[PDB]
Amino acid sequence: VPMAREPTVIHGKREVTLHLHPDHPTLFSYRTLGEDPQYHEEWVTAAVERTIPVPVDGMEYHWGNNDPVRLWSQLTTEGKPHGWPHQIVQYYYGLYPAATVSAVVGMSLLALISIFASCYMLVAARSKCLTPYALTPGAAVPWTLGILCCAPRAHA
Amino acid sequence: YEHSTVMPNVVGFPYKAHIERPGYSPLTLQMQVVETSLEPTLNLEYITCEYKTVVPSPYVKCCGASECSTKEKPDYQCKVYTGVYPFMWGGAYCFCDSENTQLSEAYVDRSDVCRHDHASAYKAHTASLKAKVRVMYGNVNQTVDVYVNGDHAVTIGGTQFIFGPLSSAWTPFDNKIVVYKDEVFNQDFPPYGSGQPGRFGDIQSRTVESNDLYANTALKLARPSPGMVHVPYTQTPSGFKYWLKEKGTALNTKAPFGCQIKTNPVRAMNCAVGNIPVSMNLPDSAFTRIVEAPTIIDLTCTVATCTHSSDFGGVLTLTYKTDKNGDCSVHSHSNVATLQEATAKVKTAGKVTLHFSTASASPSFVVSLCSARATCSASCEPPKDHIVPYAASHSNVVFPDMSGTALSWVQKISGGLGAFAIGAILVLVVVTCIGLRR
Amino acid sequence: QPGRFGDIQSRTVESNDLYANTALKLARPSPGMVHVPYTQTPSGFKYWL
Numbered sequence: 001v002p003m004a005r006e007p008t009v010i011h012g013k014r015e016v017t018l019h020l021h022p023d024h025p026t027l028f029s030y031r032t033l034g035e036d037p038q039y040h041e042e043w044v045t046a047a048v049e050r051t052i053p054v055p056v057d058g059m060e061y062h063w064g065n066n067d068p069v070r071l072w073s074q075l076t077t078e079g080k081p082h083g084w085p086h087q088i089v090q091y092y093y094g095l096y097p098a099a100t101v102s103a104v105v106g107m108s109l110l111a112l113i114s115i116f117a118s119c120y121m122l123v124a125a126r127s128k129c130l131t132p133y134a135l136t137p138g139a140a141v142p143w144t145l146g147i148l149c150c151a152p153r154a155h156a
Numbered sequence: 157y158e159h160s161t162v163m164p165n166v167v168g169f170p171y172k173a174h175i176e177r178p179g180y181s182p183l184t185l186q187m188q189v190v191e192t193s194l195e196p197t198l199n200l201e202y203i204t205c206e207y208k209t210v211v212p213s214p215y216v217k218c219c220g221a222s223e224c225s226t227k228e229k230p231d232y233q234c235k236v237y238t239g240v241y242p243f244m245w246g247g248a249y250c251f252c253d254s255e256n257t258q259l260s261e262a263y264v265d266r267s268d269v270c271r272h273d274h275a276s277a278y279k280a281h282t283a284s285l286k287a288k289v290r291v292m293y294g295n296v297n298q299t300v301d302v303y304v305n306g307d308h309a310v311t312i313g314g315t316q317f318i319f320g321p322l323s324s325a326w327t328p329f330d331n332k333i334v335v336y337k338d339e340v341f342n343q344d345f346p347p348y349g350s351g352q353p354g355r356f357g358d359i360q361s362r363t364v365e366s367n368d369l370y371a372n373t374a375l376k377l378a379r380p381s382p383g384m385v386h387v388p389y390t391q392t393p394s395g396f397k398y399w400l401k402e403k404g405t406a407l408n409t410k411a412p413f414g415c416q417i418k419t420n421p422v423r424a425m426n427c428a429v430g431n432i433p434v435s436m437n438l439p440d441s442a443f444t445r446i447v448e449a450p451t452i453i454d455l456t457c458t459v460a461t462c463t464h465s466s467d468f469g470g471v472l473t474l475t476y477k478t479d480k481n482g483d484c485s486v487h488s489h490s491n492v493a494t495l496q497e498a499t500a501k502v503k504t505a506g507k508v509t510l511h512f513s514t515a516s517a518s519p520s521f522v523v524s525l526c527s528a529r530a531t532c533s534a535s536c537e538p539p540k541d542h543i544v545p546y547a548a549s550h551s552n553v554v555f556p557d558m559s560g561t562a563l564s565w566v567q568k569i570s571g572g573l574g575a576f577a578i579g580a581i582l583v584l585v586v587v588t589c590i591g592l593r594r
Numbered sequence: 595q596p597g598r599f600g601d602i603q604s605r606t607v608e609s610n611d612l613y614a615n616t617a618l619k620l621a622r623p624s625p626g627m628v629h630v631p632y633t634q635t636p637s638g639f640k641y642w643l
């Protein structure tokens with residue numbers, strides 16, 4: 001039996017673009033060799049072009065009578081690690097683009113809650129400590145007037 | 157000296173075990189799973205093959221009537237037709253014009269080559285795993301064949317190894333299996349004695365050599381045409397041929413975890429899942445007395461370049477001070493970085509270099525040379541190449557160290573916000589305590 | 595590139611130089627034969643046509 005030609009592979013980001021040139025109907029099939037595989041098989045007849053996904057687990061494709069060939073993707077991305085805070089997020093977004101967003105959102109909400117609580121504590125403390133002297137026509141004690149910014153800057 | 161460890165069930169992974177006897181020099185063993193084989197347990201149910209309809213010649217009774225007789229043959233059919241006036245090439249025999257009767261007979265039989273081209277229906281349960289492990293250390297190489305269940309101990313150079321049962325219990329074969337030549341199908345075949353015409357298992361034979369046969373193909377006979385002798389009949393086509401045409405998929409091209417299915421016997425090879433516990437028992441001669449090994453003091457580790465790629469893309473340097481030159485047993489005490497070697501030559505110069513493979517942006521692991529220790533931290537840049545033809549040589553751990561750049565930024569920001577909150581709390585408590593002290 | 599338009603190129607019709615990139619690879623001959631096997635990606639001009 002004859003062995004068909006090897007296809008031309010072009011590498012992408014977790015993808016392989018694969019150029020197929022048959023002379024007679026050959027069987028092309030591939031599977032992703034992870035926990036849940038991506039199965040497919042076909043009877044390629046004319047000159048076609050296929051794009052097949054290659055996750056970090058890898059995959060194998062079987063073209064004609066040739067032996068199966070395995071390809072593994074590699075942990076590559078586009079961000080810049082160890083840079084400014086807006087580049088580490090890009091780096092960890094190129095990899096795993098579903099948990100980075102969730103973690104960033106969670107941390108941002110925690111920061112906002114903490115800062116709002118702190119600002120609230122300052123406001124409440126000022127209200128408590130500036131109302132006792134604000135029920136009588138008394139002196140604001142310029143020593144205290146300078147330290148805390150109350151409503152009357154200089155008028156009593 | 158009893159020792160135990162757990163090694164991944166990944167073919168070709170360079171697992172290295174560190175054995176520390178407090179009275180002797182450390183030892184490093186290299187174990188590697190060259191090959192596996194997951195063999196299930198089968199019980200043959202029946203055998204299917206194409207059928208062959210046997211039609212004996214008709215019996216035409218000239219001037220009389222014939223009576224049908226029943227027989228014990230698979231899917232037997234018999235009928236008698238009245239009023240036939242057959243013909244032959246030279247003239248029409250059975251002189252009686254209309255007082256004739258034809259008897260038609262047909263039955264089904266197993267094909268001629270059913271013992272060469274047949275499909276088997278099995279039941280698979282309680283698979284048993286097997287392996288072929290290569291163990292090297294000291295000056296001993298050699299590969300052995302083991303059963304992976306805690307009931308087979310093999311001796312390699314005076315050391316006893318027991319490979320414990322697999323961590324998981326996952327088998328790609330379902331309860332019912334159909335095997336044809338070199339292909340395994342996860343199929344739900346009908347039970348013996350209840351096949352259906354036109355589909356898989358229309359005729360079922362308990363064994364390839366078994367005499368009994370159960371056939372159900374809706375064979376039917378029809379009245380012959382006038383002036384002919386032919387025994388007409390109608391029959392639903394073979395179920396085996398249509399199963400061949402529309403079986404669909406397989407298990408060879410569908411199995412998870414990237415493992416080959418094979419036949420004779422059925423087994424799923426090199427099928428990466430789970431962990432393999434190991435038990436050892438080493439003699440006193442494998443270790444070296446601490447007096448013989450060199451002494452290592454002042455161990456400092458620095459990282460020249462780091463790159464979290466599949467190959468061994470990191471380089472490490474160790475500085476020390478030694479009294480005499482010899483050998484040491486290097487090891488990395490965290491699975492973040494997987495070293496390449498298990499021995500290194502120490503010399504009076506005070507410099508040695510090692511190669512490691514990692515998959516995290518910022519690793520942090522402790523490396524030991526002979527009896528010394530050192531902590532290494534590094535910053536690693538991603539690789540530029542998109543796809544490679546070899547599997548990963550790291551354990552695939554990606555969470556960075558708590559002293560890395562990202563986690564340092566998180567720590568600094570959280571510390572600033574915590575300082576702000578603590579200041580607010582202290583101010584409010586001071587105000588309330590001033591209110592109370594009055 | 596092999597297999598597509600212009601896998602072989604020449605400056606002009608009568609030009610002596612030629613650039614060809616067709617992925618021509620030789621294979622080991624079978625035992626007991628004299629046949630110099632090879633494999634090659636088909637013509638790019640025909641598939642362009």
Ligand SMILES: *[C@@H]1O[C@H](CO)[C@@H](O[C@@H]2O[C@H](CO)[C@@H](O[C@@H]3O[C@H](CO)[C@@H](O)[C@H](O)[C@@H]3O)[C@H](O)[C@H]2NC(C)=O)[C@H](O)[C@H]1NC(C)=O
Nearest residue numbers: 216217218219220221222249250251252253254255256257
């Ligand atoms: C030679 O040919 C003659 C026909 O010309 C055959 O005679 C036929 O014989 C059969 C039975 O031997 C007859 O069938 C039955 O006969 C009984 C007799 O009472 C009748 O009651 C039934 O209704 C039925 O017809 C048939 O009638 C008879 N035909 C005739 C007499 O014309 C003869 O059998 C042939 N020779 C041999 C050796 O068979």
Ligand SMILES: *[C@@H]1O[C@H](CO)[C@@H](O[C@@H]2O[C@H](CO)[C@@H](O[C@@H]3O[C@H](CO)[C@@H](O)[C@H](O)[C@@H]3O)[C@H](O)[C@H]2NC(C)=O)[C@H](O)[C@H]1NC(C)=O
Nearest residue numbers: 186188190290291292293294295296297298299497498499
């Ligand atoms: C322990 O034993 C195994 C098997 O004897 C050793 O592996 C063997 O290493 C040699 C040296 O590299 C290999 O020979 C060469 O292999 C290349 C591979 O392409 C080939 O092109 C050369 O012509 C030459 O044959 C040999 O193939 C290899 N065997 C296997 C089964 O992989 C291993 O190195 C030994 N360990 C130590 C520490 O010596």
